[PDB]
Write a protein that binds this ligand. Structure first.
Ligand SMILES: O=C(Cc1cccc(Cl)c1)Nc1cncc2nc[nH]c12
Ligand SMILES: O=C(Cc1cccc(Cl)c1)Nc1cncc2nc[nH]c12
Lengths: 304, 304
């Protein structure tokens, strides 16, 4: 029992972290096989960041200008290329600690672990969700760029995020491992709208099921609702509309607890309309949306 | 910017996890040098757990009865001894992945990361605090026993906790790495009082400073208080009395923000007496006490 915001064990990812320096800028890189991936803004100075012409800036750089250090050892760079907002630095040595891996583009509302790094060295690990507006509410300081987000399935690491930027609002933006930003963001020092965010309804319902499994049941009521009725409430409270696809993904939790998804929707409707009344659910005084139905089953079943 | 419940990177600890089986019981062990440490209740059957005579139960076991597997390879057990509530199994091979380490007994109110494991395999990592009543509110299932808590300082892992038991209340109890339980607990299947818990005041104040550093400032007021006045409020709200030692440890955060510790105490006093009024601080609708002043400085400075 107990329910925590659990991250994946970070060991497989720690073994891939390197420091990349270009000119006066240092950030993190990810070394997989004989390629090091890092944000392309490693080639910029502070003056360049207002409106960088990355193509022109990269033309002034040669392989020897990219200093890549894996712990205390230097990697020899034999090639460089820009793919969208990432640089791929070909090195002459395959990372001996390369785990089985994939590059995936996650959907908004999905979760992943972040290994925050500085100077190629891991500082900490935390779990978070990709917001419906494609930002992440992480914990990142100057130098964290190049830190990655990932999920693990047995021995395979699926990398889904590389950190690039902090918006003036203090939220975070980054790319998939092919360098494509999640959301409308561009890698420039300009104010950029993130746009309206919403609460991840299917994740809140999953967390309510986790609460019932772990004994927090005070919010269960004698009511039920329909998808249409519930979605009128979700609209008022800035929650994502619940679809049958979301109801289907909640099937395993509904079967385990014996609580029909629409009955749990009625509990959620009552919590939205009345608040918590000073009570808590799984140590939280707000409705949590950073656990997917898969995360709940994984944590409640002890998947390694 | 941003503030997360960040755990230490778990890689150094993942390299020490092994599966220990004795008879029909399987749990986790920690392999450091040529010793494997695990909860002594690995020698019990379910019938034994009501009131185990560990000395007698261990006498019926020989080195060959302890099956220790590091991933897929078997370790040869050449000695066994019980130290308080842990078993130390001497093996013929030093763990090649043994990091620099220490065994420490942490104080209540301090924090640490847990690497939850099942069958010797890591499932997840999370940060938590040792409650003032010596329990931890973890996320652990049957088979998680032997999972450890730890802190990292540069390249040295200080192990402070080994998981042993879940109380009937759903909270967790365990030992230091010398097998001494934190708190009054015994390794038996009996209902056991945890006793009154309190909120870790110095940690709440540290988190309020983290909130100010990250821009959440709505709770700052025009008031101040004294240690005596604040402690009358702490008493009413089941908070630990604040001492000058706690004020001293908050010095760096008070210097960084320019907010005197007693002025932050007045903000905390007002939040305790009036609640959050439906507002949040660092994404929380309650006063968080699982970040120490050291954790706040570490996260806000990017220590690796
Ligand atoms: O935002 C940047 C640098 C940057 C500026 C403009 C565009 C780009 Cl792509 C990158 N670094 C950063 C990241 N995360 C957190 C931080 N806190 C301070 N700086 C942080
Ligand atoms: O509590 C036990 C077994 C046990 C019983 C009596 C005394 C001792 Cl020392 C150990 N295992 C366990 C731990 N954490 C979480 C769990 N959820 C289910 N079982 C869990």
């Amino acid at each position: 029992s107990g329910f925590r915001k659990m991250a994946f064990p970070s060991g497989k990812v720690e073994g891939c972290m390197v420091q990349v320096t270009c000119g006066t800028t240092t950030l993190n890189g990810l070394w997989l096989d004989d390629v090091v991936y890092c944000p392309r803004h490693v080639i910029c100075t502070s003056e360049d960041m207002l409106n960088p012409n990355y193509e022109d800036l990269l033309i002034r750089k040669s392989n020897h200008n990219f200093l890549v250090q894996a712990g205390n050892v230097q990697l020899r760079v034999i090639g460089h290329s820009m793919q969208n907002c990432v640089l791929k630095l070909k090195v002459d040595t395959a990372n001996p600690k390369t785990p089985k891996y994939k590059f995936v583009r996650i959907q908004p509302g999905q979760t992943f672990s972040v290994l925050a790094c500085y100077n190629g060295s891991p500082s900490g690990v935390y779990q978070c969700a990709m917001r419906p507006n494609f930002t992440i509410k992480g914990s990142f300081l100057n130098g964290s760029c190049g830190s990655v987000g990932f999920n693990i399935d047995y021995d395979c690491v699926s990398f889904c995020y590389m950190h690039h930027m902090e918006l003036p609002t203090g939220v975070h933006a980054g790319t998939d491992l092919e360098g494509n930003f999640y959301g409308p963001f561009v890698d420039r020092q300009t104010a950029q709208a993130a746009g309206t965010d919403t609460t991840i309804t299917v994740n809140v319902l999953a967390w309510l099921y986790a609460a019932v499994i772990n004994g927090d049941r005070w919010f269960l009521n004698r009511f039920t609702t329909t998808l249409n009725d519930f979605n009128l409430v979700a609209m008022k409270y800035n929650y994502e509309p619940l679809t049958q696809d979301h109801v289907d993904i909640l099937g395993p939790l509904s079967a385990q607890t014996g609580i029909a998804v629409l009955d749990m929707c009625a509990s959620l409707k009552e919590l939205l309309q009345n608040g918590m009344n000073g009570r808590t659910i799984l140590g939280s005084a707000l409705l949590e949306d950073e656990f997917t139905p898969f995360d709940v089953v994984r944590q409640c079943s002890g998947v390694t």
